[PDB]
Protein backbone atom coordinates (compact mmCIF):
# COMPACT_ATOMS: atom_id res chain seq x y z
CA UNK A 1 0.00 0.00 0.00
CA UNK A 2 0.97 3.66 -0.35
CA UNK A 3 -0.91 6.06 1.92
CA UNK A 4 -1.18 9.75 1.06
CA UNK A 5 -3.08 12.64 2.62
CA UNK A 6 -5.80 13.52 0.12
CA UNK A 7 -6.81 16.53 2.25
CA UNK A 8 -3.38 18.05 1.67
CA UNK A 9 -3.37 17.33 -2.05
CA UNK A 10 -6.87 18.81 -2.27
CA UNK A 11 -5.69 21.95 -0.45
CA UNK A 12 -2.92 22.41 -3.04
CA UNK A 13 -5.38 21.64 -5.85
CA UNK A 14 -7.79 24.32 -4.61
CA UNK A 15 -5.10 26.99 -4.66
CA UNK A 16 -4.23 26.15 -8.25
CA UNK A 17 -7.92 26.04 -9.18
CA UNK A 18 -8.40 29.59 -7.94
CA UNK A 19 -5.49 30.68 -10.17
CA UNK A 20 -7.04 28.89 -13.14
CA UNK A 21 -10.24 30.83 -12.46
CA UNK A 22 -8.29 34.06 -12.44
CA UNK A 23 -6.94 33.42 -15.89
CA UNK A 24 -10.43 32.47 -17.01
CA UNK A 25 -11.78 35.87 -15.84
CA UNK A 26 -9.16 37.60 -17.97
CA UNK A 27 -10.32 35.64 -20.97
CA UNK A 28 -13.90 36.67 -20.35
CA UNK A 29 -12.93 40.31 -20.63
CA UNK A 30 -11.06 39.66 -23.88
CA UNK A 31 -14.12 37.88 -25.30
CA UNK A 32 -16.21 40.94 -24.41
CA UNK A 33 -13.63 43.13 -26.17
CA UNK A 34 -13.84 40.95 -29.30
CA UNK A 35 -17.64 41.07 -29.31
CA UNK A 36 -17.72 44.85 -28.95
CA UNK A 37 -15.13 45.92 -31.57
CA UNK A 38 -16.83 47.23 -34.74
CA UNK A 39 -15.25 48.28 -38.03
CA UNK A 40 -18.15 50.73 -38.14
Amino acid sequence: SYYIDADLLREIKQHLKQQQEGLSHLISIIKDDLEDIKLV
Binding site: I12, L16, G22, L26, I29, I30, V40
Partner: protein, 85 residues
Protein backbone atom coordinates in the same frame (compact mmCIF):
# COMPACT_ATOMS: atom_id res chain seq x y z
CA UNK B 1 -12.78 52.16 -20.08
CA UNK B 2 -14.15 50.18 -17.14
CA UNK B 3 -13.31 46.80 -18.69
CA UNK B 4 -9.73 47.88 -19.40
CA UNK B 5 -9.27 49.25 -15.88
CA UNK B 6 -10.82 46.13 -14.35
CA UNK B 7 -8.51 43.92 -16.46
CA UNK B 8 -5.49 45.83 -15.14
CA UNK B 9 -6.73 45.45 -11.55
CA UNK B 10 -7.33 41.72 -12.01
CA UNK B 11 -3.79 41.24 -13.33
CA UNK B 12 -2.30 43.07 -10.34
CA UNK B 13 -4.45 41.02 -7.97
CA UNK B 14 -3.46 37.83 -9.81
CA UNK B 15 0.23 38.60 -9.31
CA UNK B 16 -0.30 39.13 -5.58
CA UNK B 17 -2.25 35.88 -5.32
CA UNK B 18 0.49 33.96 -7.15
CA UNK B 19 3.08 35.24 -4.67
CA UNK B 20 0.92 34.39 -1.65
CA UNK B 21 -0.23 30.96 -2.86
CA UNK B 22 3.31 30.06 -3.88
CA UNK B 23 4.42 30.41 -0.27
CA UNK B 24 1.34 28.71 1.17
CA UNK B 25 1.90 25.68 -1.08
CA UNK B 26 5.63 25.59 -0.35
CA UNK B 27 4.87 25.35 3.37
CA UNK B 28 2.35 22.57 2.74
CA UNK B 29 5.07 20.68 0.85
CA UNK B 30 7.92 20.68 3.36
CA UNK B 31 5.38 18.99 5.63
CA UNK B 32 5.06 16.01 3.32
CA UNK B 33 5.93 12.57 4.68
CA UNK B 34 7.42 10.65 1.75
CA UNK B 35 9.60 7.68 0.80
CA UNK B 36 9.42 5.34 -3.30
CA UNK B 37 12.00 7.88 -4.40
CA UNK B 38 10.39 11.27 -4.32
CA UNK B 39 11.73 13.86 -2.00
CA UNK B 40 9.86 16.97 -0.87
CA UNK B 41 12.45 18.85 -2.93
CA UNK B 42 11.42 16.97 -6.08
CA UNK B 43 7.83 18.04 -5.51
CA UNK B 44 8.91 21.60 -4.72
CA UNK B 45 10.84 21.90 -7.99
CA UNK B 46 7.87 20.58 -9.95
CA UNK B 47 5.51 23.00 -8.20
CA UNK B 48 7.88 25.87 -8.94
CA UNK B 49 7.65 25.14 -12.67
CA UNK B 50 3.86 25.02 -12.43
CA UNK B 51 4.03 28.50 -10.92
CA UNK B 52 6.22 29.59 -13.81
CA UNK B 53 3.58 28.37 -16.27
CA UNK B 54 0.89 30.42 -14.51
CA UNK B 55 3.04 33.56 -14.65
CA UNK B 56 3.66 32.96 -18.36
CA UNK B 57 -0.04 32.44 -19.08
CA UNK B 58 -1.03 35.66 -17.32
CA UNK B 59 1.56 37.61 -19.32
CA UNK B 60 0.41 35.99 -22.57
CA UNK B 61 -3.22 36.90 -21.89
CA UNK B 62 -2.20 40.48 -21.07
CA UNK B 63 -0.47 40.62 -24.47
CA UNK B 64 -3.59 39.24 -26.18
CA UNK B 65 -5.58 41.99 -24.46
CA UNK B 66 -3.11 44.65 -25.63
CA UNK B 67 -3.14 43.30 -29.18
CA UNK B 68 -6.94 43.45 -29.25
CA UNK B 69 -6.56 47.13 -28.29
CA UNK B 70 -4.19 47.54 -31.26
CA UNK B 71 -6.75 45.80 -33.47
CA UNK B 72 -9.41 48.31 -32.39
CA UNK B 73 -7.08 51.24 -33.09
CA UNK B 74 -6.40 49.89 -36.57
CA UNK B 75 -10.15 49.44 -37.20
CA UNK B 76 -10.69 53.08 -36.25
CA UNK B 77 -7.78 54.18 -38.40
CA UNK B 78 -9.25 52.33 -41.37
CA UNK B 79 -12.77 53.66 -40.80
CA UNK B 80 -11.44 57.22 -40.59
CA UNK B 81 -9.56 56.78 -43.85
CA UNK B 82 -12.53 55.13 -45.57
CA UNK B 83 -14.64 58.16 -44.59
CA UNK B 84 -12.10 60.56 -46.10
CA UNK B 85 -10.38 61.89 -42.99
Amino acid sequence: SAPADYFRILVQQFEVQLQQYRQQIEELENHLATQSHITPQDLSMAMQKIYQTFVALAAQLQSIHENVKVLKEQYLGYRKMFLGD
